[PDB]
Amino acid sequence: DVPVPLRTYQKQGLNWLASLYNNHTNGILADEMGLGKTIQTISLLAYLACEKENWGPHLIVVPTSVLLNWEMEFKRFAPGFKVLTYYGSPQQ
C-alpha cells in the first residue's frame, strides 16, 4: 500500500484500489456481498483526497435502491464529501 496516515476487508479493498489508481489501472473487484466493496470504493475516494491534491468532480454509478447505501456511508465514513443534489432533473 501507499496510503496517507474500520475493518480489514474494506481496507484491503483500499489497498488494492490504491495499487490500481496510482497505476491508473482498473479492476474487476468481484467481492461477494457483505465484504463492503462499496466501502472500499469510498475508501479509495477518500484516500485520493490526501494522496494528491487531485479531487475534482468524481462520478459513481449504482443501482438507485443503493443510493442511501452510498450517501449514508459517506456521512458515516469520511463525512467530508461535499455533495450537490441532483433530483428533479428539469427544475428540482
Binding site: 501507499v2 496510503p3 496517507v4 496516515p5 490526501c50 494522496e51 494528491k52
Partner: peptide, 29 residues
C-alpha cells in the same frame, strides 16, 4: 559502526513512519 548501524536503521524506520507524501511547509503547517 554500531552507532552508524543504529542511526541509519532507525532513521530509516522513522522515515517510513513519516515518508508518505509530505508537502510544502507553508501548506503543511
Amino acid at each position: 559502526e554500531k552507532k552508524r548501524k543504529i542511526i541509519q536503521e532507525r532513521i530509516r524506520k522513522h522515515k517510513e513512519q513519516e515518508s508518505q507524501h509530505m508537502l510544502t511547509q507553508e501548506e503543511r503547517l
